[PDB]
Amino acid sequence: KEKWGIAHIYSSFNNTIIHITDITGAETISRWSGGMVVKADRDEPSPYAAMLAARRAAEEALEKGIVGVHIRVRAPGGSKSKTPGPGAQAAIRALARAGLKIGRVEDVTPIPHDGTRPKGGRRGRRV
Amino acid sequence: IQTTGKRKTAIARAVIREGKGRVRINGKPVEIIEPEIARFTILEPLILAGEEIWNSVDIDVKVEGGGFMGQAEAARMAIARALVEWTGDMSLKEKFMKYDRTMLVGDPRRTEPHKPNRSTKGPRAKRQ
Amino acid sequence: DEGYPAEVIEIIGRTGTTGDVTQVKVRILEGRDKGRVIRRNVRGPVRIGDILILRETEREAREIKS
Amino acid sequence: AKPLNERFFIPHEIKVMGRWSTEDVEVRDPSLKPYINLEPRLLPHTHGRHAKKHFGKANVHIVERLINKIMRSGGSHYKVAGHFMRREHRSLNSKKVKAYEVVKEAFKIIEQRTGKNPIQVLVWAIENAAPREDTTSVMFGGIRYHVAVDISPMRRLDVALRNIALGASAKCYRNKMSFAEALAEEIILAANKDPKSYAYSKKLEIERIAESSR
């Protein structure tokens, strides 16, 4: 029976994390951050770190009897940003290109109805 | 038959008549020209033309002005027009223009005048 | 050399910062995506129907925003 | 003058340079077929108006282009590994007869040492030394990023051929070993995808970096 897992692709503007879990999401299979594949902290969110780490986790999953994957895209959510980082698309393309049969590719950013006051103060992050 | 040829500053006057096949630049055999590149340039028109044209006509061309390469190209234009007028068949004209254009159109390009602000090094040259 | 040639069809427009990169549409002539049309960039002069060699078919350029 | 006259007469049956009629040559890469000019012509020089033509470069014979980018090979902003590669002793620029002679000699060297068509060896080297990806810094809102970009067949031809020329110059410059020997050695290395050549090495370098700019 064709084996389908869950690929949580978290993407902020500082890092991207690809975590592969069973169909219940209760058991870990492959979990590779941007930090695994680069040596400058600034480089963690770049799409190349993303696709390299994603392919690594993908081959690791394939080695462990995984064939199909449902993608779960995630922005930081909450009071933090909502647009996924630039590397999420690159990592999704990489997971496709690593020989994984892609199913549902949805967003799971937890959107609040009425959340806490965000950070940064009243006059904003005065860059 | 009379023909002329213009190229850069080397101008060629050519006369083609019936003969064994001897072809002469300034009354000198075409095979003993010291630069070889000029030899091929002068030779281009009669290779593709054929051997019967080569050995059916005597051609005398005199070229004055310019450089030796320019002299070769002017002789090329002159001999090309010479075979053109002597044979007067369309097919040779067609293959002449197919191999290249110059021998039926010439090269009307010249050297543009030099302009001040370091004219010596060229027209479009200037200082630092 | 795992490359994939593809045939240009249509030129989207000069792209990149300096316009020296040209955006075109290319049809993959061989590979896992045979016949697929992709927007791809070209450095150096290009025309319709040029055979351009790809290292990766998956990469794509964003639509030119005017 | 006997070799000179015999080489004058041998290409009487329409041969590029003196020998190596071009029918036997085969282009393996599909990209450069409609651009590499294989018309049989005795002398590789037309003095043509190709610069003023946007696409007139495809008409120029690959050997004429070879002599062309040979004559220009001297002096540059390219302080590659800190060297100024200038021709101070009778530079190649504008002396296309000397360059013509040097390509003739290197072609003879290729013929002898490889025992096959030197034009076909050059064809293989051109195929083997053309990169397939470059890098461009594209920005949105002043945030530049290096993006891999596909190279046109003609730009690939240009950059690869310039690279082999610069490899030949790097080899001969400031050495006893002549220019013809340098060019023959470089072209044979590039023919067999030898990394020792500048041409294939810098093809690899151009492929890389753009490799990481994805």
From Swiss-Prot, chain A:
Residues 106-127 are annotated as: Disordered. PROSITE patterns: RIBOSOMAL_S11. GO terms for cellular component: ribonucleoprotein complex; ribosome. GO terms for biological process: translation. InterPro entries: Ribosomal_uS11, Ribosomal_uS11_archaeal, Ribosomal_uS11_CS, Ribosomal_uS11_sf. One of its GO terms (molecular function) is rRNA binding. Gene3D superfamilies: Ribosomal protein S11. SUPFAM superfamilies: Translational machinery components. Keywords: Ribonucleoprotein, Ribosomal protein, RNA-binding, rRNA-binding. It holds the Pfam family Ribosomal_S11. Located on the platform of the 30S subunit. Part of the 30S ribosomal subunit. Belongs to the universal ribosomal protein uS11 family. This is Small ribosomal subunit protein uS11. It comes from Pyrococcus furiosus (strain ATCC 43587 / DSM 3638 / JCM 8422 / Vc1).
UniProtKB/Swiss-Prot annotation, chain B:
One of its GO terms (cellular component) is cytosolic small ribosomal subunit. Gene3D superfamilies: 3.30.230.10. PROSITE patterns: RIBOSOMAL_S9. Residues 116-128 have a biased composition (Basic residues). Coiled coil: none annotated. GO terms for biological process: maturation of SSU-rRNA from tricistronic rRNA transcript (SSU-rRNA, 5.8S rRNA, LSU-rRNA); translation. GO terms for molecular function: RNA binding; structural constituent of ribosome. Residues 104-128 are annotated as: Disordered. Keywords: Ribonucleoprotein, Ribosomal protein. Pfam families: Ribosomal_S9. InterPro entries: Ribosomal_Su5_D2-typ_SF, Ribosomal_uS9, Ribosomal_uS9_archaeal, Ribosomal_uS9_CS, Ribsml_uS5_D2-typ_fold_subgr. Residues 104-115 have a biased composition (Basic and acidic residues). Belongs to the universal ribosomal protein uS9 family. Part of the 30S ribosomal subunit. This is Small ribosomal subunit protein uS9. It comes from Pyrococcus furiosus (strain ATCC 43587 / DSM 3638 / JCM 8422 / Vc1). The gene is rps9.
Curated annotation (Swiss-Prot), chain C:
SUPFAM superfamilies: Nucleic acid-binding proteins. Keywords: Ribonucleoprotein, Ribosomal protein. One of its GO terms (cellular component) is cytosolic small ribosomal subunit. The keyword Ribonucleoprotein applies. Transmembrane segments: none annotated. HAMAP family: Ribosomal_eS28 (MF_00292). Belongs to the eukaryotic ribosomal protein eS28 family. Part of the 30S ribosomal subunit. This is Small ribosomal subunit protein eS28. It comes from Pyrococcus furiosus (strain ATCC 43587 / DSM 3638 / JCM 8422 / Vc1).
From Swiss-Prot, chain D:
GO terms for biological process: translation. Pfam families: Ribosomal_S7 (PF00177). Disulfide bonds: none annotated. Keywords: Ribonucleoprotein, Ribosomal protein, RNA-binding, rRNA-binding. Signal peptide: none annotated. Gene3D superfamilies: Ribosomal protein S7 domain (1.10.455.10). GO terms for cellular component: small ribosomal subunit. The keyword Cytoplasm does not apply. It comes from the Archaea. CDD domains: uS7_Eukaryote. One of the primary rRNA binding proteins, it binds directly to 16S rRNA where it nucleates assembly of the head domain of the 30S subunit. Is located at the subunit interface close to the decoding center. Belongs to the universal ribosomal protein uS7 family. Part of the 30S ribosomal subunit. This is Small ribosomal subunit protein uS7. It comes from Pyrococcus furiosus (strain ATCC 43587 / DSM 3638 / JCM 8422 / Vc1).
